[PDB]
Amino acid sequence: ITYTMLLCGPAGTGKTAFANNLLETKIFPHKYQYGKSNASISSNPEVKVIAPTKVVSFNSFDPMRANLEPGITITSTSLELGDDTVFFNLIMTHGIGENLDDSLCSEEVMSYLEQQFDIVLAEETRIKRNPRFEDTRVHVALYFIEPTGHGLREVDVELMKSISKYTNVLPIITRADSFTKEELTQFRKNIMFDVERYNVPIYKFEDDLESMEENQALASLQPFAIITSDTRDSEGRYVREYPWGIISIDDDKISDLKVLKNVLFGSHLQEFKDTTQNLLYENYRSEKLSS
């Protein structure tokens, strides 16, 4: 299958580390410590680099130019993680939250999603159509919530709404180690209250008794709080290390990351794909045809 996932959030959330952990391959480099390798060959047997990292959109360490605003930059890195063979193109946003005005960033991301929708529509409405054409539509999208502990900001809400317009959007609390149990609970409650207040159309984990129970539990879990590291233990366990203690990404209580990974690449992958392909895209196409 051809799966497409977007990772959007303010700079300093942990999207690069999250992607490296998910792939089990350090295919994405962290900013300012990069250029040693960016789209290198995978260190994972299942991970393949079918296309290096490349920019799909642009709108704009050097200490003298640190003041300069980066703008927004959207990059799609294509990989093949394996019938089971999945062609997974990961889109990522950089420079979001690193400028004064972030309206440009929201505009660019929404425009990229809309242009992919339009490309698919044009292929569909073609006298000679390529039946196996590669769709660039973002089947799922994860928005990283900066660990404020208070609630959702303005840029957070607007970006999540923009992403929701064209793809499913999932609220993901990042760096949950920054929060204690009570603090993380309160932060999650605040996030849910704010999305309800502003009516952000965040994705809902809402035919089988067990399936209904799992959906209910996953909905109660959201926003998903996760700890991610691209560094591993000598034994080979992705872990964070602090002077007061060492965190393991595998630990269930520390991170909901493995539930999130299961839903993203396992259970609900097809659900995200079908909803983005046959509900959002179809409604957009109907509106265009009415235009």
Binding site: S178, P243, I246
Partner: protein, 289 residues
Amino acid sequence: PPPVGISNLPNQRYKIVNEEGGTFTVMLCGESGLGKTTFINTLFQTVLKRDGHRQEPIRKTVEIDITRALLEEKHFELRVNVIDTPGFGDNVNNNKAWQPLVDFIDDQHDSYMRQEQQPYRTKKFDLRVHAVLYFIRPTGHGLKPIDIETMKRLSTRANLIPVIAKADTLTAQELQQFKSRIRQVIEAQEIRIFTPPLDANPDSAAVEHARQLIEAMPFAIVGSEKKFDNGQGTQVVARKYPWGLVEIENDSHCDFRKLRALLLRTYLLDLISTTQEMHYETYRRLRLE
């Protein structure tokens, strides 16, 4: 052969200083969720501030709120003026968000100047900010354009003390790298940050502590209003996570005690004197050009 009381003049000065009382003014700049309220509640051992102001319109207007209190420790009274920056950096468009804060500092300086313009001037209401703590989110990446320009704008109005918020969030190597990047940026951008006075000293250890303090910038701040046992029978103020406990009073875990030395314990008088002899003087000169 009797002595003169030249050696007692300093003890007289001490007597008047301790019987008069002091006033400290600190502006805590940053975004929402940088452990600022908890920091000021931890530095003074008391709850000077609150629970967040929240559930209001998402587009926050950068305002200035001053929380004033009278604190007594050893029969010495201090008027603490904790100035805040609600809504700063919490919006999609944060352009010209540094204007209100620098404007407030300039307004306080002008107020003091106009108190001097009084014909028969009396006791002085001095709200000039003796310290400015700019909190940086622990992104572990670098300083944002908003951050650098606000800091540079307010670095001439008063004293600037960069601090890395929620420094426990970052791992040791990550926080050290973040500190190095911040120092390089503020060195290239030429931002001016308060440095403890080590000169170039009779108390070689005091200027040595000055050196230790200036080699620990931007300061790592870990603040908690709850205390936990360390396992040896001693309760230390700390942040309790299941993997480990981040004690605020251990120099190995945070630079909070260094910041307390700079702000209240060791270099508080120096901060006040620099704010009143260097910054205010330049503002007054330019205002009276």
